[PDB]
Design an enzyme around this catalytic site. Sequence first.
Site, PDB file in Angstrom:
ATOM      1  N   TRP B 133     -53.501  -7.092 -19.148  1.00 19.07           N
ATOM      2  CA  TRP B 133     -52.940  -7.736 -20.310  1.00 19.07           C
ATOM      3  C   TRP B 133     -53.525  -7.033 -21.540  1.00 19.07           C
ATOM      4  O   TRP B 133     -54.742  -6.863 -21.659  1.00 19.07           O
ATOM      5  CB  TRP B 133     -53.315  -9.208 -20.242  1.00 19.07           C
ATOM      6  CG  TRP B 133     -52.655 -10.115 -21.197  1.00 19.07           C
ATOM      7  CD1 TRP B 133     -51.306 -10.313 -21.375  1.00 19.07           C
ATOM      8  CD2 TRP B 133     -53.313 -11.010 -22.082  1.00 19.07           C
ATOM      9  NE1 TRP B 133     -51.100 -11.269 -22.332  1.00 19.07           N
ATOM     10  CE2 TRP B 133     -52.314 -11.715 -22.781  1.00 19.07           C
ATOM     11  CE3 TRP B 133     -54.655 -11.287 -22.355  1.00 19.07           C
ATOM     12  CZ2 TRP B 133     -52.617 -12.660 -23.740  1.00 19.07           C
ATOM     13  CZ3 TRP B 133     -54.948 -12.222 -23.300  1.00 19.07           C
ATOM     14  CH2 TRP B 133     -53.934 -12.903 -23.986  1.00 19.07           C
ATOM     15  N   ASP B 214     -58.357 -15.134 -14.951  1.00 24.93           N
ATOM     16  CA  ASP B 214     -57.402 -15.391 -16.007  1.00 24.93           C
ATOM     17  C   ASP B 214     -56.145 -15.829 -15.264  1.00 24.93           C
ATOM     18  O   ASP B 214     -55.521 -15.037 -14.555  1.00 24.93           O
ATOM     19  CB  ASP B 214     -57.163 -14.107 -16.814  1.00 24.93           C
ATOM     20  CG  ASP B 214     -56.101 -14.275 -17.901  1.00 24.93           C
ATOM     21  OD1 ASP B 214     -55.372 -15.288 -17.861  1.00 24.93           O
ATOM     22  OD2 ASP B 214     -55.974 -13.383 -18.782  1.00 24.93           O
ATOM     23  N   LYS B 249     -46.976 -20.774 -20.102  1.00 23.85           N
ATOM     24  CA  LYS B 249     -45.820 -20.327 -19.352  1.00 23.85           C
ATOM     25  C   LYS B 249     -45.325 -21.353 -18.349  1.00 23.85           C
ATOM     26  O   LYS B 249     -44.122 -21.638 -18.286  1.00 23.85           O
ATOM     27  CB  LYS B 249     -46.138 -18.996 -18.671  1.00 23.85           C
ATOM     28  CG  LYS B 249     -46.332 -17.868 -19.702  1.00 23.85           C
ATOM     29  CD  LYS B 249     -47.739 -17.307 -19.699  1.00 23.85           C
ATOM     30  CE  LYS B 249     -47.861 -16.167 -20.731  1.00 23.85           C
ATOM     31  NZ  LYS B 249     -49.038 -15.273 -20.459  1.00 23.85           N
TER      32      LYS B 249
END
EC number: 2.6.1.1
Lengths: 399, 399
Positions: B133, B214, B249
Amino acid sequence: HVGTFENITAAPADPILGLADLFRADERPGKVDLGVGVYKDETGKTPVLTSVKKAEQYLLENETTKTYLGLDGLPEFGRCTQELLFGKGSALINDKRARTAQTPGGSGALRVAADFLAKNTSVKRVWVSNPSWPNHKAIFNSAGLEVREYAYYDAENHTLDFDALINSLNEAQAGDVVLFHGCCHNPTGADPTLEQWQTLAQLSVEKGWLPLIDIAYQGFGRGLEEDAEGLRAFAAMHKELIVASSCSKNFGLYNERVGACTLVAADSETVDRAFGQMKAAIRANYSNPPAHGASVVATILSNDALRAIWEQELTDMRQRIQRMRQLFVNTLQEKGANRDFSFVIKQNGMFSFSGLTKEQVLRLREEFGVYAVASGRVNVAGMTPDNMAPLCEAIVAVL
Amino acid sequence: HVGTFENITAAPADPILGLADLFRADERPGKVDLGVGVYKDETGKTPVLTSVKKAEQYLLENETTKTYLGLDGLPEFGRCTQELLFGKGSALINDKRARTAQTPGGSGALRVAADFLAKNTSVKRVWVSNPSWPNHKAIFNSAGLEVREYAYYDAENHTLDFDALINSLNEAQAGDVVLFHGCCHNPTGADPTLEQWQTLAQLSVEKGWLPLIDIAYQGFGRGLEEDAEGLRAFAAMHKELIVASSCSKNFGLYNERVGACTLVAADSETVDRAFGQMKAAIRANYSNPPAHGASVVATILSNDALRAIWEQELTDMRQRIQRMRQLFVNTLQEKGANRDFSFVIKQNGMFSFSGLTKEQVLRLREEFGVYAVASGRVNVAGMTPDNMAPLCEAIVAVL
């Protein structure tokens, strides 16, 4: 392998939290909490404002996505914030010298400002008032900036000692930041007069300080516009400044984390350049700001009817605070206070230093169930017409 | 004197916004945006989930204050987060080894984790996958932590090069943080198998890394429980973990900034010491986390009916993504693509590397209005049954 967390030193106990626990466990019916840090109404509640509830219903009914906003948040909220701060039609806004990033609270704005300054400027030191708002030091230190205090409140005589202030700021160097509370100084309630603000602004130009205005109580002092006078006196004289603003208190949006960091520079090119770097500071932190509270604010301010409801709510809060200030002084006198507390009616916002010693504060809690913080700071919004006589009798008894 | 801001240099233009700008100015009707970073449904929208709307209605009806909560946010949100991550009947939870601070998104969680680590531990280095990311480096660097990359994706052959991964991690030292994406690796979609997770977990214990998981796509890979298998494999084996979780999300709550930083330590007293200092890191940052999104999540998860609705919505998102992966491959084949794209079918989540060159990506944009990022990353949720044929025809034409 020893644990990475095995040897972490416990953070110091939060004396605030400890008082809060003691209070909620206190079974005495006469107890009164003057130590609270938020607004309360006459019934002891911190309600959601009706204007906010209406805005939230509107959002519920109309929002069709929660997709990410830009790093600077909702443009409308930025515009509304700049107008509140500088006034609509401000030459500053017209000249495109200001850029605003919506942040999670004024607290978030202060940290974003701190990180931005640390990473992109030669600022090493931030000056704050004595007494300080406790959280400033932690925020600025976290970014590697030193925090120093300037003279401000004369606690014995209950005044803003302006001459001491000015003289103490001679120590501040060009390129230092000097932080002023825009209005309703927290915790003293002692604010510069407009003439003093103008003197400070001129001095800041002469000395080359970067002013940072922390404004979380616009509307609680004398009014929305009046409360911005100081900030605007600075904006008129300076090429540059930073404003960390909050809607936590004036919109009662505390836990939604609604505020902004506004940069002002000499020209559009410079402020845009600076702002790009401020966005980088945001990208390395929480990425983009929480929409709900800022949306609520934009929704209220961009609608005439909602805005009017909100302005009245704010006026109601301001006036209740002023009423309690006056009633506190009068009731102290009536209960035979052996000295004068008239300074309380010369101070702005929900907080004043009572002038009580920590021993008197302790005695007040133990003997009378009246709770204040160790500094003697009292929140006059913790006072009501019904609790005023006993709390004042208690205060008189410990003087 | 003047200008503290005058010497600030311009931030590099971010190509993301640049591409968004180009896309926005592109008036062609056939545009396909595979560069977006959020879920889109079959109609190309990023809707608010029905479960979320229902929760927001309930909050509007029931909330009576927005006063500050603690720096760790809403306790119920913390508990629900922990239950999702670790599962019902987790020994870890039973032993009171976990504490969770609600944070402004997983991004906030990562920064809070970073600041907490920087100020309270000896961690110097955080390891992330090649590729990872894009924001990880900025966040950890902001806190003074070095970021190093480990091997992960074999781009030519479309595989998680597990042997390369394991070997590259031999460079990670005891006490370094190693960051793994919990599921739906962003941007490759290549995830370790359970056996590979178990192997990584064992390696991590042997080497003394502090794992940071994460996890921002729980439920988008194979399902809620399955997508937590990796995290739980780590949890089973470790005395300490940090989890940065996001509801952006899987609840479609992107702009409300709902996530958490969960600390796990050897025992309750230890995690309490750590957690206290994490709270201090929060206090020096944005202070309170934003209530609305977390309140929504807690409301959904603590109600059986609402939760069942949410899970169905999440399943629908997951399954749509899988269907687009399958359809993309079959359509490319039918269009006579001069090579095999079957790797797309097995990859997890909304992102894959297409394998397109930047020349091909440029041509795709300029000639066909098909937008991918320069890396060739594609968001398969940008694909629909309706746009798939022309999309694949364009791709075939540039191969």
